[PDB]
Amino acid sequence: KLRVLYDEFVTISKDNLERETGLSASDVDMDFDLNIFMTLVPVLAAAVCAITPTIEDDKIVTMMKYCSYQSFSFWFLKSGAVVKSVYNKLDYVKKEKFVATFRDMLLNVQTLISLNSM
Known part of the structure; x- marks a missing residue:
């Protein structure tokens, strides 16, 4: 399910990034990116608010x-x-x-961190 979310995130991101910058995207590497999100989760949670299933849309947009x-x-x-x-x-x-x-991606990555911690 994370793969579906991630592919969606990437597809939307590429199209818009490319249209804005006239640049081409580099190759996709999901495992690399999941590791990036693992670093981002705690920082976003500290700088904005806890990442939970009920987090406000406004907070996600701030993240x-x-x-x-x-x-x-x-x-x-x-x-x-x-x-x-x-x-x-x-x-x-x-x-x-x-x-x-984006919210569901963050929630799934946080689940992975929790698993790795236990």
Whole structure:
């Protein structure tokens, strides 16, 4: 299920990043990116609020402000764009779906951290 979420995140991100920058994406490496998210989860939770199933959309959007695409496999060091820059280009319905996708990704990654911790 994480793979489906991640592919969706990547597909939406690439299309918008490419349209904005005229640049091409680099190869996708999910395991690399999951590891990046594992670093991001605790920092986002500390800087914004706890990541739980009930987290407000507004809080997720704030987290998107601080997540830089330069860190991910498919946009590695390409530009300084953050996730909110992609969110900003989506229509009303797609913004809502993107928030859900990102939230659920973060929740799944946090589950992995919890597993590894135990």
